[PDB]
């Protein structure tokens, strides 16, 4: 719900692919060394199908 | 609308968040949460505007 | 062909067919059998393969035909040495 | 009864999973201590990670203790230490692995994007996958009552469970559980059943992850690979010179971040070994194997989880992924600061002594041994070392034909590298041929050039039958000269030129050459009068040949000695009558359309000459006072700022609107810089009065400054505009622009003020410069990326399609035509002519044949041409649909390489291209080729239908337009933002504008057509490069748009899986092999798509050329999943692997090979 409307909503595309945005908008621990590449692989490269592989992983 | 998405309601419930916010791990009591923030703006071997 | 090179396409399309066998007939005469057939006039081996394509004479056939009589002098003017081997492991 | 088992010729590399057993295949021992070095003796441990036993010894033949030492024992290991005594190379190949006590994961194979571990088995990655096998949740593994088959329980449900049930559905926790997990899965059974289940009553709300998963698992059971080797137990070790630990300076030893890798994860396997055997604690144990995995999965790509530390360096360590994730240094080279050569031939450079020296030492030692004088090898090292004369005169002999090529530092094209003859020059600087200096964009300001030696005796010969100077006549961009003659020349021929009347004139006759004599011995001027000589012309027709055309006309002392210079052919003084300009470099083109090759190097060589010596006969200069200021400067800078003061004043009682005054005050002040610039032109360009027989004339200025004006030479009207006029408008950094503009100009004094502003300028253009030379290379990356893969071949198919071409007309509304569009291009099929006949099929345009599309005058603008976008090739280019522009005046060679000179040709004149309803530019460009949506894109009628509103805002909604005629109806959706075209009852045609905007390429490949779509791509790619003044010809934009459209979709019912996007190539190959091989319903139709330079070259055969560009832990994991080979026809992929490039002097290598890897 939260996580995906507003990742969907938002990146579109966020033009210059704006990193520093959503993950603020995420929950849980921050500052962390995991969850970063797990967005730096979703924006790009495999377009539109890629963000919907996303939610669903 | 700022307090409306406002977990925190008191002040052990904002040291706390704050002090999970900047340091996520150790499980946040009432010295730590206390002492780090008060080791952010409000003490000169931690902060100072010249 | 000190600057072109490029009369020599002509006579076989491709430019790179024509450094091919250009370069597999300066490789005879730089190293083994030399004997060019346009005068050398002091130039490399690189210029002179050249010179030969353009006059005409020293192509991709010519060269490989040329390489077919080479193995059959080779090989059947000197049988004698291979017929007797033959008969070496019955 | 071949069957070799040794290293021979390969054709292919196989990239899969390795089995333990697979892994144990390389094992030449077993790593077991973390011990490196020795302390004391220096010497390799028993069994560490720098063992003698296991990998290789360290000296070259002798063994570790000292019991064998010379070559008596190369294949003898030693009896007191089983140290195989043969080279020290071996340390350098030889592998070794570690076996570990409990399983453990790869990092790759776990989390890279998709969880490949987790979507062959179907469960959440970071979620479910983590907290199964760090010991926290227990998993189950398959069950035949209450619980499933991969569900999550805790340590409470799984007792409770065992309780219910237990000793009939034992499932473990960890790493082995997960192993136990993909070992149990059968890959086929469920290959069947999902295959079953996806397709039983479910629309499009299922269909996604149905033919996704089926596919990949279909995929994965065809590989070969065993999902049990998906988590390894056996870690294989990296060879120890690949990680050495050398000895620096004075101790102080210098060694790689993987030992101390390798030695943290033998060390946590070793006490996790020694906790199976003592004491199990279950806390213990379970940490240590989570320890484990720490070390192994920092060892095999840190990335990732914050990144192990140590090692004193407050960075991280650079794991074996590091060292393969993101310049060739090359032998006989050098390189030196460049000085321009006048003497110098058009196929010849400096090159220094000394460095030439230095050089082809080698090539010397063998001429030198070859000859005499040297005794021996050793003896010629000695004799150059101490350069003996006579050495240098061998040198004469070694760099006598033995091309040398030269390379600048920013190569945006194929001119980058040129080849010349190598001319020793006493000196230590590089001089090169002022005429190829504009093909390097090099200037004199200090730059310094790059020289390499062509070694192989083919390589000598690529570089003179390609590389050379001389076979670069014309650019590859467009059909001009490239070796056009500049500035210093230019002014030369334009001072041949010039008709002065009188001053020592009269119309004294003579015959050509005679002329000279007449020159030198003062008497007559230069540039006069005219007077009238005998000039001999020579012209061919029809049977070719030479004929004469002796006759009497009117030149100069410049033209007719000039005329000397001009070669045989030529329709002569017609060429000289003129002037030197730009019909300069046409007379060149001329030349070698019509004559060929040598004779129009010579007349290059001889006009250089001319030019250079005349030039320096001339004397021109540049006083102050060559910058003559007009007089009504300040007449009209008064009347300008007289109108703006009034206008200010207007302002000052409100009448005018004042909150756009800015604007018009703007124009004002404008008006008056064209009226200086009007002025200051038309009064440095006439001018003078001469005096002839009874005086009173006027001719042109002869003002120097005009003088390299008007004929090329580096000066352009705005420079001059601000030398002696003034510099207009000047830009602020808020991006507006100043109501004062630079009233005063550089002939005269400029207050501090004004020069504070003029910064602005000059910051912005440096920067901006800085700016779009990297972002021109970055765009030519990309687009050679994605095009450097196609190379003509196949000779020439047939087809006869291809787009209409028309000279581009903004005619319609502004008035501007170019017809040179068509030259050197295929002819599709006789395309007409006002009668009968004419213009054959297949015939390519001539130079002189396009010239004759004049006299079938005016009428005939539309020519159906072969292109590079239609053909019905396969994977290649046919020689006939491209065309024949290159520096050859003939068709392209067959087996050339159209990808990377056409991408080369786009992104060359990228450095002159300023960024930013017209974008502009070169981001313009870029949004063009990546097919990007506008932000506002218009829509388009899919089919021919009845226009009719499709119930006034229901949705949603958001009006609703819907076209519906003859069959089957279409609901747009129009979101009420943005007007309308077309009113309701109105019929529209297959592919009708109904928003009035900004056309998406997309909609236009997907309904106009692909002609369309491809026309309107080059011709709104080169509108940006009319206002750049780029000539760039449509041949190479046509080339990337091919592959560019490499991709499509099929949609009805084949052997291809519907769903799935492929490309035409492997479409159009099997479609053509299913209508003729058992029917042709067993295929289906596809459908053309459009996907950007990105978007294409992502999509790629081989997994090595993917490994190049884009993200290598990606392409190298997947690749590794489906067993996957490389066979082999790639350009990029075939380069890294160091073999011949499958295009050029290659190709046939490659043809030759291909075809005989069809016997298996
Ligand atoms: N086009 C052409 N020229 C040949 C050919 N063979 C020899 N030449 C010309 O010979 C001239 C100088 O060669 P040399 O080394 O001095 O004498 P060489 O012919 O016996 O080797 C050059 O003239 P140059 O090129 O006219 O000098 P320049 O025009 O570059 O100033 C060179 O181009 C050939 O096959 N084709
Ligand atoms: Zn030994
Ligand atoms: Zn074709």
Redesign the interface.
């Known amino acids: 719900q939260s996580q995906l409307k507003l990742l969907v909503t938002r990146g579109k595309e966020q033009g210059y692919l704006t990193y520093a945005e959503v993950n603020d908008h995420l929950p849980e ?6 969850q970063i ?2 967005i730096i ?2 924006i790009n ?1 495999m ?1 539109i199908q890629v963000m ?2 996303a939610p ?2 | 609308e700022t307090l409306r998405v406002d977990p925190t309601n008191d002040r052990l419930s904002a040291l706390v968040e704050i002090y999970r916010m900047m340091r996520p791990g150790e499980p946040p009591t009432r010295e730590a949460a206390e002492s780090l923030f008060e080791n952010l703006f409000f003490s000169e071997d931690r902060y100072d505007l010249s | 062909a000190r600057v072109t090179v490029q009369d020599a396409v002509e006579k076989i399309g491709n430019r790179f067919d024509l450094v091919l066998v250009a370069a597999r007939r300066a490789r005879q005469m730089q190293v083994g059998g030399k004997d060019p057939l346009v005068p050398e006039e002091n130039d490399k081996t690189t210029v002179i393969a050249l010179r030969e394509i353009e006059e005409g004479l020293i192509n991709n056939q010519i060269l490989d035909v040329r390489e077919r009589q080479e193995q059959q002098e080779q090989e059947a003017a000197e049988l004698q040495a291979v017929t007797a081997i033959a008969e070496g492991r019955r | 009864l071949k069957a070799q088992t040794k290293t021979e010729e390969f054709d292919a590399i196989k990239i899969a999973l390795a089995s333990p057993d697979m892994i144990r295949s390389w094992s030449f021992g077993e790593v077991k201590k973390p011990e490196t070095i020795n302390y004391r003796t220096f010497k390799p441990e028993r069994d560490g990670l720098f063992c003698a036993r296991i990998f290789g010894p360290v000296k070259d033949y002798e063994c570790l203790c000292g019991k064998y030492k010379r070559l008596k024992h190369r294949g003898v290991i030693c009896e007191k230490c089983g140290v195989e005594v043969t080279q020290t190379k071996v340390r350098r190949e030889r592998m070794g692995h570690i076996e570990l006590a409990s399983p453990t994961a790869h990092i790759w194979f776990l989390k890279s994007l998709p969880s490949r571990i987790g979507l062959l088995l179907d469960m959440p990655l970071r979620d479910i996958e983590r907290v199964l096998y760090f010991e926290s949740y227990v998993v189950i593994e398959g069950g035949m009552t209450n619980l499933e088959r991969q569900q999550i329980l805790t340590e409470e449900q799984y007792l409770d469970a065992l309780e219910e049930f237990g000793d009939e559905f034992d499932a473990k926790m960890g790493a082995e559980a997960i192993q136990a997990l993909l070992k149990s899965m059968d890959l086929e059974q469920e290959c069947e059943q999902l295959r079953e289940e996806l397709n039983e009553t479910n629309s499009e709300t299922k269909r996604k992850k149905l033919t996704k998963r089926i596919k990949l698992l279909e995929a994965f059971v065809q590989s070969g690979n065993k999902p049990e080797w998906m988590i390894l137990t056996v870690l294989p070790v990296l060879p120890p010179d690949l990680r050495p630990l050398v000895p620096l300076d004075g101790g102080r030893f210098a060694t790689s971040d993987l030992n101390d890798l390798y030695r943290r994860v033998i060390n946590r396997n070793n006490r996790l070994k020694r906790l199976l055997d003592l004491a199990a604690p279950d806390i213990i144990v379970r940490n240590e194997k989570r320890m484990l995995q720490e070390a192994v999965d920092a060892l095999l790509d840190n990335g990732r989880r914050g990144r192990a530390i140590t090692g004193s360096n407050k960075r991280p360590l650079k794991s074996l992924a590091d060292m393969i994730k993101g310049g060739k240094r090359v032998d006989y080279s050098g390189r030196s600061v460049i000085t321009v050569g006048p003497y110098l031939r058009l196929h010849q450079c400096g090159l220094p002594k000394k460095m030439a020296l230095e050089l082809f030492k080698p090539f010397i030692y063998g001429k030198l041994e070859l000859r005499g004088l040297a005794t021996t090898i050793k003896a010629a090292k000695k004799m150059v070392e101490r350069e003996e004369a006579v050495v240098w005169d061998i040198l004469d002999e070694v760099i006598r034909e033995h091309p040398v090529l030269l390379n600048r530092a920013p190569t945006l094209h194929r001119l980058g590298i040129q080849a010349f003859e190598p001319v020793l020059i006493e000196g230590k600087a590089i001089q090169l041929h002022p005429l190829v200096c504009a093909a390097y964009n090099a200037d004199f300001d200090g730059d310094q050039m790059a020289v390499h030696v062509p070694l192989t005796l083919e390589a000598q010969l690529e570089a003179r039958a390609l590389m050379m100077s001389t076979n670069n006549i014309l650019s590859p961009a467009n059909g001009e000269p490239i070796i056009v003659p500049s500035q210093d020349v230019v002014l030369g021929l334009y001072y041949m030129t010039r008709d002065c009347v009188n001053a020592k004139g009269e119309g004294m006759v003579l015959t050509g050459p005679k002329e000279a004599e007449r020159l030198y011995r003062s008497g007559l001027a230069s540039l006069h009068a005219r007077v009238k000589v005998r000039i001999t012309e020579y012209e061919k027709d029809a049977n070719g040949e030479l004929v004469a055309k002796t006759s009497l006309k009117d030149t100069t002392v410049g033209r007719a000695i000039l005329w000397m210079i001009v070669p045989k052919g030529l329709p002569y003084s017609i060429v000289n009558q003129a002037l030197g300009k730009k019909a300069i470099s046409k007379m060149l083109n001329t030349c070698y359309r019509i004559l060929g090759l040598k004779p129009t190097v010579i007349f290059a060589d001889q006009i250089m000459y001319t030019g250079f010596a005349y030039a320096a006969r001339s004397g021109a200069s540049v006083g102050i006072d060559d910058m003559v200021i007009p007089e009504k400067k300040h007449e009209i800078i008064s009347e300008a700022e007289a109108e703006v003061a009034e206008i200010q004043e207007q302002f000052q009682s409100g009448l005018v609107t004042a909150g756009e005054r800015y604007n018009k005050v703007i124009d004002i002040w404008a008006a008056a810089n064209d009226r200086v610039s009007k002025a200051m032109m038309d009064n440095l360009q006439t001018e003078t009065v001469i005096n002839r027989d009874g005086q009173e004339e006027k001719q042109v200025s002869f003002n120097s400054i005009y003088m390299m004006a008007d004929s090329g030479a580096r000066g352009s009207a705005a420079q001059i505009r601000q030398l002696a006029g003034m510099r207009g408008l000047m830009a602020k950094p808020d991006g507006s622009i100043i109501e004062t503009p630079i009233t005063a100009n550089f002939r005269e004094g400029l207050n501090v003020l004004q020069y504070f502003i003029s910064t602005h300028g000059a910051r912005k253009g440096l920067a901006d410069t800085a700016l779009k030379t990297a972002n021109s290379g970055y765009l030519t990356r990309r687009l050679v990326d994605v095009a450097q893969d196609l190379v003509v071949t196949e000779d020439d198919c047939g087809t006869h399609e291809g787009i209409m071409m028309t000279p581009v007309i903004e005619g319609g509304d502004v008035k501007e035509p170019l017809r040179d569009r068509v030259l050197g291009r295929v002819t599709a099929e006789d395309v007409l002519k006002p009668g009968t006949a004419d213009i054959l099929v297949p015939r390519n345009t001539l130079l002189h044949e396009q010239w004759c599309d004049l006299l079938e005058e005016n009428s005939v603008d539309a020519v159906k041409v072969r292109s590079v976008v239609s053909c019905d090739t396969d994977f290649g280019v046919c020689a006939h649909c491209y065309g024949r522009d290159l520096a050859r005046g003939h068709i392209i060679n067959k087996g050339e390489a159209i990808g990377v000179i056409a991408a080369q040709s786009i992104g060359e004149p990228g450095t002159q291209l300023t960024m930013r309803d017209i974008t502009g530019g070169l981001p313009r460009v870029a949004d063009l080729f990546e097919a990007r949506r506008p932000k506002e894109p218009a829509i388009l009628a899919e089919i021919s239908g009845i226009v009719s509103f499709g119930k006034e805002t229901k949705g949603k909604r958001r009006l609703v337009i819907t076209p519906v005629d003859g069959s089957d109806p279409y609901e747009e959706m129009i979101p009420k933002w943005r007007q309308l075209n077309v009113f309701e009852g109105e019929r529209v045609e297959r592919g009708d504008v109904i928003s009035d905007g900004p056309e998406a390429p997309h909609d236009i490949l997907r309904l106009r057509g692909v002609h369309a779509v491809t026309r309107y791509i080059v011709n709104e790619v080169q509108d940006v490069y009319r206002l750049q003044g780029v000539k760039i010809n449509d041949k190479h934009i046509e080339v990337i748009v091919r592959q560019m459209l490499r991709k499509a979709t099929i949609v009805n019912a084949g052997s291809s899986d519907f769903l799935e996007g492929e490309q035409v190539e492997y479409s159009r190959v099997k479609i053509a092999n299913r209508e003729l091989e058992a029917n042709g319903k067993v295929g289906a139709t596809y459908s053309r798509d459009l996907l950007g330079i990105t978007k294409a070259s992502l999509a790629t055969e081989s997994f090595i050329s993917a490994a190049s560009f884009q993200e290598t832990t990606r392409v190298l994991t997947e690749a590794a999943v489906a067993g996957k080979r490389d066979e082999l026809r790639g350009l990029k992929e075939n380069v890294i692997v160091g073999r011949l490039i499958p295009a050029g002097t290659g190709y046939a290598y490659h043809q030759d090979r291909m075809r005989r890897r069809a016997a298996g």
Not at chain 1, 29 to 34: G, H, R, T
Request: no cysteine; hydrophobic share 25%; aromatic share 0%.
């Open positions: 621990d921050i500052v962390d060394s995991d590449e797990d692989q979703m490269d377009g919907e592989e669903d992983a």
